[PDB]
Amino acid sequence: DILSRLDPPEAEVQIDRLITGRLQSLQTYVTQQLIRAAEIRASANLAAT
């Protein structure tokens, strides 16, 4: 709908905002999965011992 109702020069501006938000969300997700996996690893290490 963003494009469907506009030219390229005018749509690229909005699509870059959408891209910025959606990339920020994915970085937040991946950083928290990295922090949460290091906590699961310390627990599996205790289980092995």
Next chain:
Amino acid sequence: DILSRLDPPEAEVQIDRLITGRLQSLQTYVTQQLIRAAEIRASANLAAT
């Protein structure tokens, strides 16, 4: 190249787009190093034991 084919009022807008990206990339580098150092630290703590 932005300081050679743009006047100062137009080169600010183009320099800020680079500043934002490079800051993002540097800060991603610094987060992943904290997460990798916290893992090297536990290995060295096991080696000391």
